[PDB]
Amino acid sequence: IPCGESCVWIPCISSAIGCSCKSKVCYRNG
Amino acid sequence: XXXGXXXXXXXXXXXXXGXXXXXXXXXXXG
């Protein structure tokens, strides 16, 4: 699930809620 | 959790499946 953040320029700040960079977009659980 | 990247100036490399890092990203258990 996309978390509302991309990660081309900079890693995912949404890592704080468990999201991570996949294919340019921050996701958790698809 | 984590698992997207991070490092804070190196580190990571996925931990070869095992995660790593901490404050600066990585993941694993968390």
Curated annotation (Swiss-Prot), chains A, B:
Q: Where is this cross-link: Cyclopeptide (Gly-Asn)?
A: G30-N29
Please verify whether the record's keywords include Disulfide bond.
Answer: yes
Q: Which Pfam families match?
A: Cyclotide (PF03784)
**In which tissues has expression of this protein been reported?**
Expressed in leaves, petals, petioles, roots and runners (at protein level).
Query: Any S-S bridges, and between which cysteines?
Result: C3-C19, C7-C21, C12-C26
Write out the GO biological process terms. Answer: defense response; killing of cells of another organism
Name the PROSITE patterns on file: CYCLOTIDE, CYCLOTIDE_BRACELET
Q: Which UniProt keywords apply?
A: Cytolysis, Disulfide bond, Hemolysis, Knottin, Plant defense
At the top level of its lineage, which domain of life is listed?
Answer: Eukaryota
- Could you describe the post-translational modifications of this protein? This is a cyclic peptide.
Which family is annotated?
Answer: Belongs to the cyclotide family. Bracelet subfamily.
According to the UniProt entry, the note on domains is: The presence of a 'disulfide through disulfide knot' structurally defines this protein as a knottin.
Q: What does this protein do?
A: Probably participates in a plant defense mechanism. Has strong cytotoxic activity against a variety of drug-resistant and drug-sensitive human tumor cell lines, and against primary chronic lymphocytic leukemia and ovarian carcinoma cells. Has weaker cytotoxic activity against normal lymphocytes. Has hemolytic activity.
Name by which UniProt lists this protein: Cycloviolacin-O2
Q: Which organism is it from?
A: Viola odorata (Sweet violet)
